[PDB]
Specification:
monomer; Immunoglobulin-like; six-stranded mixed sheet; 11% helix; cell adhesion; monomeric
């Protein structure tokens, strides 16, 4: 008789019938608190020496420390019944002897519920899912196994797996068996590749991966050994330790996915020329309504000051740029504006830790998008829906738009072609919406 487990969003966990649409990311806006729930069913008359839950999340999700709650049969556990250790990227919850007593030697199946939350942060990339990963390591012997720790490849796209073998004591031993791993994209949860270590090898390297994706090596269960994934210390390196614990294979549920959307724009004129220095804010109605702003209690003074200094530097770049004749506006000049605007965008994405809707569009926290010398500007970290661009400052030599421009944020609105114009000329995909100005 085996334990059963499932992890999903609050209210949806179900070890018997796991949610079927699970792999499909659920849309959230940056700053949203994602509430998770782990449900475990422990068999009657169990005699486990170890019952450990471990969870590690991708970087776009920040584990909210102090939010962990755990119950057995809808009855909270006493503090001495478990040891909870928290890290930036997740936690470990280990039953103690007091805790194990509450799930062992029971006349009936015990239900263990663990809840907690994470915050979708500014590192989440639009349309790229973020995820958690829970594992339940247990057995009648002490178990040293835990959940895989996601990692990025190194700058060159290389990711190295290093394997060690130890007995129940921690003492090193020859390879106990061939070890097979699935290299998994930890964001989307899709298997990328299968690697195996023969007994004469302790490393393998995978090449040509995306430097901005988080991967993990998930060891295919090895009879008698538990996988102890070491803490991540550097990009491109993953270390796993095989303990000869002689326990059952871990439980590894499917996990939900979360995601934010976005929209890209290009400032152009009648003849499709691209215009620098146009400033826009976002509203939630064709007129009146409120404006998109970053939350004050979620942004530090340094982040707000970065938005200000980068904005000022951008303004001067634009001024210099506009003072130039048409022929003087070369690729190098345009490059200067594009550069200033990038530093501004990064500063804005970094300060945009959470959103609210405010009435005063001149509020310092209101999100202001500024077009660069390629006319590009974009918004990221949104819920799908209908928004309205409102121009607040026109590009030099142009009339201020008299109407708000309605735009739709969707699951593919940020990447889909057919939208009207190439965000960046030569990309091959018209993945931006045109915003037209009049002389």
């Amino acid at each position: 008789a085996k334990p059963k487990i499932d992890k999903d969003f609050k209210g949806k966990a179900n070890p018997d019938t796991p949610r079927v649409d699970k792999d499909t990311p659920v849309n959230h806006q940056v700053g949203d608190v994602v509430e998770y729930e782990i449900v475990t069913k422990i068999p009657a008359l169990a005699n486990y020496a170890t019952a450990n839950w471990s969870d590690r999340m991708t970087e776009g999700l920040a584990f909210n420390k102090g939010t962990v709650k755990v119950t057995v049969d809808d009855v909270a556990l006493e503090a001495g019944d478990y040891a909870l250790t928290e890290v930036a990227t997740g936690f470990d919850l280990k039953l103690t002897d007091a805790g194990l007593a509450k799930v062992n030697d029971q006349n009936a199946e015990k239900t263990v519920k663990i809840t907690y939350s994470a915050t979708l942060n500014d590192k989440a990339i639009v349309e790229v899912p973020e995820s958690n990963d829970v594992t339940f390591n247990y057995g009648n012997n002490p178990d040293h196994g835990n959940t895989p720790k996601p990692n990025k490849p190194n700058e060159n796209g290389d990711l190295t797996l290093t394997k060690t073998w130890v007995d129940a004591t921690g003492a090193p031993i020859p390879a106990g068996a061939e070890a097979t791993f699935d290299l998994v994209n930890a964001q989307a949860g899709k298997v990328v590749q299968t690697v195996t270590l023969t007994t004469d090898k302790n490393t393998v390297t995978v090449n040509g991966l995306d430097k901005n994706t988080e991967y993990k090596f998930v060891e295919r269960s090895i009879k008698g050994y538990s996988a102890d994934y070491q803490e991540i210390t550097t990009a491109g390196e993953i270390a796993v330790k095989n303990w000869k614990d002689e326990n059952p294979k871990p439980l590894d549920p499917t996990e939900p996915k979360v995601v934010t959307y976005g929209k890209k724009f290009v400032k152009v004129n009648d003849k499709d020329n691209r215009l620098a220095g146009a400033e826009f804010v976002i509203a939630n109605a064709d007129n009146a309504g409120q404006y998109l702003a970053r939350k004050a209690d979620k942004v530090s003074q340094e982040e707000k000051q970065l938005v200000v200094t980068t904005k000022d530097a951008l303004d001067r770049a634009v001024a210099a740029y506009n003072a130039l004749t048409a022929q003087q506006q070369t690729q190098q000049e345009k490059e200067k504006v594009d550069k200033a605007q990038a530093a501004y965008n990064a500063a804005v994405i970094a300060a945009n830790n959470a959103f609210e809707w405010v009435a005063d569009k001149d509020n310092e926290n209101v999100v202001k998008l500024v077009s660069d010398a390629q006319g590009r500007f974009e918004i990221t970290g949104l819920l799908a829906g209908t928004y309205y661009l409102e121009e607040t400052k026109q590009p030099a030599g142009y009339a201020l738009l008299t109407s708000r421009q309605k735009f739709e944020v969707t699951a593919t609105s940020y990447s889909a072609t057919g939208q009207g114009i190439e965000y960046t000329a030569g990309s091959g995909k018209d993945d931006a919406t045109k915003v037209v100005n009049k002389k």
